[PDB]
Design a protein around this ligand. Sequence first.
Ligand code: CBC
Ligand code: CBC
Ligand code: PLP
Ligand code: PLP
Lengths: 366, 359
Amino acid sequence: VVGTFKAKDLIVTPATILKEKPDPNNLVFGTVFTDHMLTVEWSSEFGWEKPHIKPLQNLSLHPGSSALHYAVELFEGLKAFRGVDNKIRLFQPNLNMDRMYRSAVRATLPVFDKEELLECIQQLVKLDQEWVPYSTSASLYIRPAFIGTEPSLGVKKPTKALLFVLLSPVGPYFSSGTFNPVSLWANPKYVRAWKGGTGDCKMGGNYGSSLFAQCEDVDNGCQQVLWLYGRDHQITEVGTMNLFLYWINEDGEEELATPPLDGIILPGVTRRCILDLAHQWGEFKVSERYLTMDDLTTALEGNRVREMFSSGTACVVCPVSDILYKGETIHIPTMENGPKLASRILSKLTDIQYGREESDWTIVLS
Amino acid sequence: VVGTFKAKDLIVTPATILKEKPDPNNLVFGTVFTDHMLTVEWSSEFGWEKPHIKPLQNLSLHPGSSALHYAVELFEGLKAFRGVDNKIRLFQPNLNMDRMYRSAVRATLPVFDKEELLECIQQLVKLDQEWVPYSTSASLYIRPAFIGTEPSLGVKKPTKALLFVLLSPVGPFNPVSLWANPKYVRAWKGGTGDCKMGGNYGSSLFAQCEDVDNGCQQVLWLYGRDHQITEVGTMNLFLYWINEDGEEELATPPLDGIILPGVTRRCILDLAHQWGEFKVSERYLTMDDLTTALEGNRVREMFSSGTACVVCPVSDILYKGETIHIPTMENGPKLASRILSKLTDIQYGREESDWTIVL
Ligand SMILES: O=C(NNS(=O)(=O)c1ccccc1C(F)(F)F)c1cc2cc(Cl)ccc2o1
Ligand SMILES: O=C(NNS(=O)(=O)c1ccccc1C(F)(F)F)c1cc2cc(Cl)ccc2o1
Ligand SMILES: *Cc1c(COP(=O)(O)O)cnc(C)c1O
Ligand SMILES: *Cc1c(COP(=O)(O)O)cnc(C)c1O
């Protein structure tokens, strides 16, 4: 009956015991959780139930829940930042609501009002706002999660669902003053996503398949997987991050390149922001364009590569120093070239996030 | 540290209040559950905990559990059958243990002893014996499920996992129409399509809804530039036809990475090989192969195979705005019904085969 839950209807149950906050200089990503969570029930029969902010607790799930059997699930990732002026800000959160809604449609999970969800998240962050780290390098990670809770074993659109939101303090990925570059494991035997698949959505199924390649990656002394696609060996994504290459292209032009949104690339918020920034600066060519391993190695051979970095919410920007490919270690001169652009981008994005630069990209906490 | 759980140290906690069994005449597939369940806990620090048979209950899961975020999960599907002689039988259950083990490796979930799990399952079915329907048209569906319960949001190999088993009384030609849209691809080479990992299935619900929107019951999964016909929903695809050489042939797509190696598929192949009445070919089949054969009146039957239906005749394919009729039902379907009869006879103990194990 009810098309969406409403922030107006929020039922809040404060915790009676409050946990001590962690040292912001000693945070490991996604391991410590705050006092409270958002939960909202849905059923086909009654529609959306009233949303609850309540103490962080285990989920009680029928063991037949479709999220556990057929990966009927999706997530988001966005952050709250305590500013230089001690104001807490969200960064481009409407883009995450847009993406989550679209992933829900693709998953066949129930549709919701994006502004109502945004306001419920605002209220949850406001309640746990002291968990937003008092550090200009740490932030509060927000994990909205949407699962099918259909008890029956038929492979079908769920008639029961749970939307929930977790909060987790996260620290810097740089340390001792500098970036921590990654080595990438490039094995064309694995594919992250395919044309006709769901790689342009944040559905859980895209990620469970990537764990094997990641373990093999770690066994070979690499931190992330470089995801290759097709007979041409297109470079697509770095782990769970978008791929950027800053180089002199085939025409001899200084260029920032990233793979196009042709269905196998997750449309990152960070990725969009970087494209926007680089276009605005107007200092070099910006291309959404295919990039192969042969393109890369040829350019490296002729000293045309400047930097390679990955982009995502957790780290904003992550420089790439090495790629393990066909039994060889190929060096990327990212760190030797500054990294000039990667550092410039990180500074710009963090300025905005922490309120050093006024931009419409941020929103002050409700 | 503990490499496997063992059926030896099974802890059995029977329910004090038992539920009434459903009418075996009106069962809805996976909607009704028995009194008990198996659960086995794992962690990287201590290895496999002791297994438990206990009352069916909700799972208490950390909201960060990787099964909920990154689909760190797999399942199996197999059945128990109350024979004509009242003996309860499992059917090729070691093949399900083999496949579950493969799926866990690909998923990075902890490995276990296959013989130990089968025995834990046998003890579970044994406890809940009376739930195996008193009907030769019904069976007990067995659902082993294996999930990551790692509380942290980092995308990595789980340090926490839960293995559980559910039991569900299920009942019972009604041919299906297939919706064929090449813009959805079920599986890719370098993917996980040959495992029963949950991630393979979440991505399929949109296509199935679209299928229903158009009066079709299942999706025909197409692959590649040549539009290879691969699987029928959650079933393997069989084509009974006269091939291009003018030979009568049973054909099915080969196991090149994008096809789930079905148990039913295996059994049908074994049987058709044994009979030696027609050619048996694991080979590529395209939409053009099929439409060309249909024009020349060379197609006899098309059916899917899986544990839930055993065999499912196909009457129509909707592809590129066309309605392509398959003469399955106008040809008996004799092969489909022969297979259904054969497997049913073995499953319900009407004939002996090493494929069945008495509980
Ligand atoms: O930003 C990163 N990931 N992108 S993300 O933030 O949007 C994301 C996407 C999908 C799943 C999980 C994640 C997250 F949160 F990183 F865990 C990321 C991964 C990563 C791995 C290393 Cl080793 C270093 C820096 C890193 O940053
Ligand atoms: O046997 C079937 N599916 N194969 S299955 O049995 O191994 C299976 C595989 C993956 C997920 C779920 C299932 C199951 F159990 F059907 F739900 C099946 C699907 C199906 C759909 C229709 Cl419309 C009619 C008969 C049918 O039988
Ligand atoms: C989330 C994600 C991205 C990065 O997206 P952001 O919105 O910038 O955090 C890129 N690739 C994959 C596979 C992702 O899951
Ligand atoms: C399980 C399944 C099959 C059928 O396999 P059986 O072992 O015969 O039940 C076929 N295709 C897919 C995608 C499946 O998951």
